[PDB]
Design a protein around this nucleic acid. Structure first.
Lengths: 129, 123, 157, 80, 205, 82
RNA sequence: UAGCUAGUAGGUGGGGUAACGGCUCACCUAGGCGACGAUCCCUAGCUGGUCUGAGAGGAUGACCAGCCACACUGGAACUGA
RNA sequence: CCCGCAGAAGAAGCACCGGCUAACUCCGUGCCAGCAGCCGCGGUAAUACGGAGGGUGCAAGCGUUAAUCGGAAUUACUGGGCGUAAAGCGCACGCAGGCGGUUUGUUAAGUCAGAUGUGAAAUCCCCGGGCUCAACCUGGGAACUGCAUCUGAUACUGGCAA
C-alpha cells in the first residue's frame, strides 16, 4: 500500500528507461529530490525539477546515449523490510567502482566514493550502476 | 523467503542418515558369521552371490558379502566386516574384510592383492 | 590467429517409420584471443561434418568483448534459459578458474584470469550462450564514462 | 555517571516491587533485520509511586530479593 | 623419492627433451623419441583437457625431480606469496640448490647435481648442506668442498655447460669451481616453453 | 605469592623460556598474569639471548612480587647498564 | 511437551553467612514465570580454537591453554586463609 | 655435529588402466566365476571378470572402510522457489506482530565518526630470526569482525509535538 516511495522512484526510472519514455514524473519528496540530485550530478539523468506547492511533482528527464538506456541497472538495497547500514570501510563498490551507490550519511546523501573520502558511512540506498 | 518469516522459523537443515548403521564411527566391526550361504541377485544380473548373516558384537544382526573367488567360512568363523553395499542384493550393506581373523585371502590373486588380503607371492 | 575449440558432441535421434535416425551435433567456439569470440552449433549426419559445419557458424557470429588487459572489467552475471553464469575479473587471480564449456569460451576470447561459477542447469549449449551475452553485457570504463560522468578520471578517481 | 535503563511497567501487584519491560533493537545475527526484543526486570521501589503502563528509569543495585537487583530512579511519563 | 628409473622414458611421455641424459653423450639420437612411450606409443590420444593440465604438471615435476607432496607445498607457498602464482612457482623451483648447481654447471644433469649434494660436496657460505630442497637467497655464493672436488668428469661436467645457455642471474668462475647467485630469475629468463597456467589451474579443481 | 619465573616453551632438547609474572600456585606453563620478556639459552651468539622489561618488572617487585633464582641471575647479567 | 510454581513471588521482623539475598523461619500480601517457548523430554562439559569453505556458513571441542564438574556409590561434616 | 675407513655395496612398493578419470593389448573364462562409487560389465572374439605384458598415478608408503565439510544456489542471509515440475490456506474479518504518505521543529534510541577500557597467552595471517633446509621453535606487528562507556554528526529509521 505504497510503503516504500524510494523504491517507487527507482522503479519509475527503471520502467521509464525500459519503455523509452523521455521523462518521468512522480510525487515529490525531500528524500527523492535529494537522491535525484545525486543522479544529476553523476550523469545518470538530466534536468530534474519540482513543480507544485502543496502536492509537488518531481519530474526527471531520462538520459540515452545511443538507442539504449543509461541506467542499465538500478536496484534498491535497504528496503523497509530490511534496513542496511554500512561502516566506512565496507561501503560497497558497485560494478568495480564504475557505477555508484547512493549512501545516506549524516552529512546528507552522497555517492559511496564521496562518502569514503569524506570518511563516514551510513545507510546505503541504491545501486544505480 | 521473506526474512521476517525466517526469523520466526529458521532454515531447517536436512538431517543426514547414515548408510551403514552398524555402530557409526567404527571403520570395522567384528561378528561371528552364522549361516553362510549363497543367494541370487536382482533382475538384470544373474549369479550366486555368496553372503553371510553375521551377528555383530554390538548386538546387530546383518548380512555381509564375501568378495573374491571362494572362501572358507563355516557357521562360527569370527570375522571382520566393513562398509560398502553391493547394489545387486536386496539389503546387503557390508563386505567382509578378506584377510582378517578367520577369513583367508583369496587363492592365487596376483593383482590388487591388498584387497582380498594375500601376501606377495614370495618366490 | 583464429584459434578454435570443440566443446561437445551429442548423438541426437529422430525416430522415423523405419527405425531411428542418428545425427551428431557439435558445439564449438572460435576466437582471436583478443576480445572477439563467437560460437557455432552445427548438426549433421557424421561427426566431422558437424564440427566443420559448426565452425562456419562460429566464424560469422563473432562479437566484440572489451576485456581489461587479459581479464574482465567488473563482475558480471550471465542468465540464459537455465544457466546462471557468474564471472569476476580476479585481478591477476591467475588461471581460467572456470568450469567445463565455460573454460573454452573464455580461453579463446583472450581472457586469462577469471573466477567463474555456473549455477543452475550446466548444459553446455546454454552455458556457452550464458557467458557470451554475459561477456557483452560487460562494459568498459572508457565507454561508461562516455554516457555518465564524462571523463575517465571522474568515474575512477 | 551511572548506567540508567528506561522501560515501561508491566505489572505492579507485589508490594514495593515492580516489573519493568525494556525494549532493545538488536540486529539479528544471521538475517540482519533489527528485531525488537523485550527484557523483563523486577525493579524495587520504596513508596511505590508507579502504575501499569508507566515509563520508568531504573538502575542496577545490590540484590534486594531473590529476583530484584534493579531499583527505581525516577518516574517520567505518568500513566493516564 | 627420486624415481630411480629409466630417466629418458619420462621424456618420451611428454614428447619433449627434459634434459635428463645429456651428461657425456651429447645428443639424443639413441632414444627413439615421439614414437614409443610404451607398447602403444604409436597411437595418439585425444588427450582431454584434464590430461593437458596433468601433463604440464608432470613435465615441470620431472624436470626438477620434485615429487608431488613436495611439489604441492611449493604451490601453497606460491599462492600465498605476492604476485604471479605461476611465476612464483617457477621461481621457487629455480631456487633449490640441486637445480642451482645444475644451472651453474657443476652437474651435467639435475640428477647428478643432487647426487653432488649426497656427496657432502656442495657448500654455500661455508656450510655443507646435504639438502636438494634448500632455497638459495639472492645474495649467495656456492662452492665445491675441497674433499670431493676435481672428480675429473664432474669437473668436465662444468665445461659441458659452456655449450648450453650461460644463464643471466648467475655467475661462475671455474677457479675453485666456484659460483655465485644473483637475483631470483625472471619468467622471461627461464625456459619460456612451459605453460604455468595449466599447473595453477590444475590444483584449483 | 606472586612470582616472576620462567615458563619452558620450545622444542625437545631446544628450550625457550619466557620470563613471566604468575601466581606461584599455577602450573609452569599454566595461567599467568603478564608476560614480561623471554630468554633463549640456545641463543647461537647472534644478537639476542634475553630481553626483559625492567621497568615492568620493577613495577611488580614494588607490589610484592618475588623474582625466582634463574631470572634473578638474568637481571644481573643484563647488569642494568650492559 | 502449553500451562508451570507454594518458600513458590513480594513485604515486614528475627536468625544465619566472610558478604547481598527465601539463604532460613514466623507472619502478611497473592503473586511470579510463559507463545521473543515457561514446564517437561532427549542429548551434551563450555571456551580460546581445530577441520572444511572464496566467503557467509556448516561440522566440531583429540593434543595445548582458560573455566567448570567429579574422585568406588549415596550422604554428611570436621580441620583450615 | 665433525673426521676416517670395505664400499653400489644395506634400502621400492601399493593402487589403477570402459566412462567420469591420467593410463592398453593378449590369453583364460562363457549371465558361470566374478566386478561394482555411479552408469553398469559378464549369455565364445570382455580395453569392465581372472592372469600376463605394457602403461598411468603416488611413494616409505599405498589402498579400502568410517567420519565431517565441500562440490550441494539440494534449507538459497550472502544465494532458490510456488499457473502446469514439490509448493498459494476454500474465502473473509481481525488481536499480537511486521511495515508505513507528506512538511517543519525537537530528541539522539537505531545509525555513523572518533577516542578510551577490554577482547588472556598460544594458534590463524604479515615482516623477520633460529634449528645444515623443511616441519618445528621464536621476536615484532596485524587481527580478534565483539562488548561497554565517553564526545561528536543528524541524512535516514524510531520517539515526541504541531
Amino acid at each position: 500500500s505504497m510503503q516504500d516511495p524510494i523504491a517507487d522512484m527507482l522503479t519509475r526510472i527503471r520502467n521509464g528507461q525500459a519503455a523509452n519514455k523521455a521523462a518521468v514524473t512522480m510525487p515529490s519528496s525531500k528524500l527523492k529530490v535529494a537522491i535525484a540530485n545525486v543522479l544529476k550530478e553523476e550523469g545518470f539523468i538530466e534536468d530534474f525539477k519540482v513543480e507544485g506547492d502543496t502536492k509537488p511533482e518531481l519530474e526527471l528527464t531520462l538520459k540515452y546515449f545511443q538507442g539504449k538506456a543509461v541506467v542499465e541497472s538500478i536496484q534498491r538495497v535497504s528496503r523497509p523490510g530490511l534496513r542496511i547500514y554500512k561502516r566506512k570501510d565496507e561501503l560497497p563498490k558497485v560494478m568495480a567502482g564504475l557505477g555508484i551507490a547512493v549512501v545516506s550519511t549524516s552529512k546528507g546523501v552522497m555517492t559511496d566514493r564521496a562518502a569514503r573520502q569524506a570518511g563516514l558511512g551510513g545507510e546505503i540506498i541504491c545501486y544505480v550502476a | 523467503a521473506t526474512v521476517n518469516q525466517l526469523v520466526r522459523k529458521p532454515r531447517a537443515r536436512k538431517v543426514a542418515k547414515s548408510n551403514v548403521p552398524a555402530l557409526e564411527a567404527c571403520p570395522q566391526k567384528r561378528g561371528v558369521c552364522t549361516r553362510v550361504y549363497t543367494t541370487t541377485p536382482k533382475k538384470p544380473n544373474s549369479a550366486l552371490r555368496k553372503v553371510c548373516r553375521v551377528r555383530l558384537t554390538n548386538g546387530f544382526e546383518v548380512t555381509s558379502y564375501i568378495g573374491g573367488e571362494g572362501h572358507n567360512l563355516q557357521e562360527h568363523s569370527v570375522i571382520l566386516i566393513r562398509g560398502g553395499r553391493v547394489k545387486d542384493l536386496p539389503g546387503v550393506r557390508y563386505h567382509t574384510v578378506r584377510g582378517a581373523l578367520d577369513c583367508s585371502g583369496v587363492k592365487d590373486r596376483k593383482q590388487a592383492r591388498s584387497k582380498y588380503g594375500v601376501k606377495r607371492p614370495k618366490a | 590467429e583464429l584459434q578454435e575449440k570443440l566443446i561437445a558432441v551429442n548423438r541426437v535421434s529422430k525416430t522415423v517409420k523405419g527405425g531411428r535416425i542418428f545425427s551428431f551435433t557439435a558445439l564449438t567456439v572460435v576466437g582471436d584471443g583478443n576480445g572477439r569470440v563467437g560460437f557455432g552449433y552445427g548438426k549433421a549426419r557424421e561427426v566431422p561434418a558437424a564440427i566443420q559445419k559448426a565452425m562456419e557458424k562460429a566464424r560469422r557470429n563473432m562479437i566484440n568483448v572489451a576485456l581489461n588487459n587479459g581479464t574482465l572489467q567488473h563482475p558480471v552475471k550471465g542468465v540464459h534459459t537455465g544457466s546462471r553464469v557468474f564471472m569476476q575479473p580476479a585481478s591477476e587471480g591467475t588461471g581460467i578458474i572456470a568450469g567445463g564449456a565455460m573454460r573454452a569460451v573464455l580461453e579463446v576470447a583472450g581472457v586469462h584470469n577469471v573466477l567463474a561459477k555456473a549455477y543452475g542447469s550446466t548444459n553446455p549449449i546454454n552455458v556457452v550462450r550464458a557467458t557470451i551475452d554475459g561477456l557483452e553485457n560487460m562494459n568498459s570504463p572508457e565507454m561508461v564514462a562516455a554516457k555518465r560522468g564524462k571523463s575517465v578520471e571522474e568515474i575512477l578517481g | 555517571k551511572i548506567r540508567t535503563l528506561q522501560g515501561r511497567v508491566v505489572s505492579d501487584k507485589m508490594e514495593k516491587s515492580i516489573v519493568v519491560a525494556i525494549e532493545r533493537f538488536v540486529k539479528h545475527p544471521i538475517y540482519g533485520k533489527f528485531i525488537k526484543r523485550t527484557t523483563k526486570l523486577h525493579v524495587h521501589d520504596e513508596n511505590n509511586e508507579c502504575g501499569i503502563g508507566d515509563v520508568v528509569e531504573i538502575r542496577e543495585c545490590r540484590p534486594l530479593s531473590k529476583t530484584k537487583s534493579w531499583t527505581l530512579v525516577r518516574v517520567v511519563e505518568k500513566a493516564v | 623419492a627420486r624415481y630411480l628409473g629409466p630417466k629418458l622414458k619420462l621424456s618420451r611421455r611428454e614428447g619433449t627433451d627434459l634434459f635428463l641424459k645429456s651428461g657425456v653423450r651429447a645428443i639424443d639420437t639413441k632414444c627413439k623419441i615421439e614414437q614409443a612411450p610404451g607398447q602403444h606409443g604409436a597411437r595418439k590420444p585425444r588427450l582431454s583437457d584434464y590430461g593437458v593440465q596433468l601433463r604440464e604438471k608432470q613435465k615441470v615435476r620431472r624436470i626438477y625431480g620434485v615429487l608431488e607432496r613436495q611439489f604441492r607445498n611449493y604451490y601453497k607457498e606460491a599462492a600465498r606469496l605476492k604476485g604471479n602464482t605461476g611465476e612464483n612457482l617457477l621461481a621457487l623451483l629455480e631456487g633449490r640448490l640441486d637445480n642451482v648447481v645444475y644451472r651453474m654447471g657443476f652437474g651435467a644433469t639435475r640428477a647428478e647435481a643432487r647426487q653432488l649434494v649426497s656427496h657432502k660436496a656442495i657448500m654455500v657460505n661455508g656450510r655443507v648442506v646435504n639438502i636438494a630442497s634448500y632455497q638459495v637467497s639472492p645474495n649467495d655464493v656456492v662452492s665445491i668442498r675441497e674433499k670431493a672436488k676435481k672428480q675429473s668428469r664432474v669437473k668436465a661436467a662444468l665445461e659441458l655447460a659452456e655449450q648450453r645457455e650461460k644463464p643471466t642471474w648467475l655467475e661462475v668462475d671455474a677457479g675453485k669451481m666456484e659460483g655465485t647467485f644473483k637475483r631470483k630469475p625472471e619468467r622471461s629468463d627461464l625456459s619460456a616453453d612451459i605453460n604455468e597456467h595449466l599447473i595453477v589451474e590444475l590444483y584449483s579443481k | 605469592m606472586v612470582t616472576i619465573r620462567l615458563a619452558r616453551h620450545g622444542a625437545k632438547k631446544r628450550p625457550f623460556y619466557q620470563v613471566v609474572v604468575a601466581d606461584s600456585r599455577n602450573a609452569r606453563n599454566g595461567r599467568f598474569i603478564e608476560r614480561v620478556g623471554f630468554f633463549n639459552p640456545i641463543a647461537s651468539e647472534k644478537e639476542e639471548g634475553t630481553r626483559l622489561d625492567l621497568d615492568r618488572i620493577a613495577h611488580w617487585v614494588g607490589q610484592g612480587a618475588t623474582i625466582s633464582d634463574r631470572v634473578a641471575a638474568l637481571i644481573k647479567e643484563v647488569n642494568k647498564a650492559a
